[PDB]
């Protein structure tokens, strides 16, 4: 019965799962934002090119 209260009080007891989820979300977001990069192109928008 004490472990339930310990988990409720603590916030980082779920470090592994939260860290994995955050890492995956950060990787996906970085991949999404990388489209804005032009990689030396005059513009990063296909229509503009």
């Amino acid at each position: 019965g004490k472990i339930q209260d310990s988990l409720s009080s603590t916030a980082s007891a779920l470090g592994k799962l939260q860290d994995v989820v955050n890492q995956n979300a950060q990787a996906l977001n970085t991949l999404v934002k990388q489209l804005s990069s032009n990689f030396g192109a005059i513009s990063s928008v296909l229509n503009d090119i």
């Binding site: 977001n29 999404v32 934002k33 928008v45």
Partner: protein, 49 residues
Amino acid sequence: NFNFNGLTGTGVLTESNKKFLPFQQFGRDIADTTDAVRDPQTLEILDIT
């Protein structure tokens, strides 16, 4: 396909409950992707999906 004040993109326009500021035209999410745009004529938020 939509061209809102020079912003080119493709999606489905739908009414958006959220309201933009008087001076804010476009709208982007965390991923830096256009999520909604204000009509330059009706001044109404149109969710882009």
